Amino acid sequence: GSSGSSGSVVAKVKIPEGTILTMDMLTVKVGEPKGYPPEDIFNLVGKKVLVTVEEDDTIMEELVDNHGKKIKSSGPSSG
C-alpha cells in the first residue's frame, strides 16, 4: 500500500546542544514522516546536535552537523 504512517524520529528526551546522538535518546513517533525518516535513523546515531532539542521534539537535518569522517578540508556551506 501507499499509506505508511511510519512516523518521524523525535527526541525521546531533551538533547542539549553539543551532545552526540544515541538510540537511548531517540524514538519514532508513528503517525507522519514529518522530520527525519526511521529508515536512515542509524545515520543520526553518532551525529552532534547544533541546538538543545526538547523532549518529544521533531529532529531535522539542519539541527545536526555533517559527519566528521573525511580526513580532508572540503565541503562549502549550503547556507
Task: Provide a descriptive summary of the structure in words.
The chain is largely without helices or strands and 79 residues long. Helix content is 5%, strand content 10%. The chain has one helix at 41-44; strands at 8-11, 26-29. The longest helix is centred in the middle third of the chain and has 4 residues, at 41-44. The protein starts with 7 loop residues before the first strand and ends in a 35-residue tail after the last helix. It is classed as transferase. Keywords: Antifreeze protein like domain, N-Acetylneuraminic acid phosphate synthase, Structural genomics, nppsfa, National Project on Protein Structural and Functional Analyses, RIKEN Structural Genomics/Proteomics Initiative, rsgi, transferase. It forms a monomeric assembly.
Q: With helices defined by DSSP (H or I, 4 residues minimum), what is the helix count?
A: 1
Strand order of the largest sheet: 1-2
Give the CATH level 1 class. Answer: Alpha Beta
Largest sheet: 2 strands, antiparallel
Q: So what's the overall shape?
A: globular
CATH architecture: Alpha-Beta Complex
- And the CATH topology? Type Iii Antifreeze Protein Isoform Hplc 12
The domain tally reads 1
Secondary structure topology:
Blueprint lengths: L7 E4 L14 E4 L11 H4 L35
Antiparallel strand pairs: 1-2
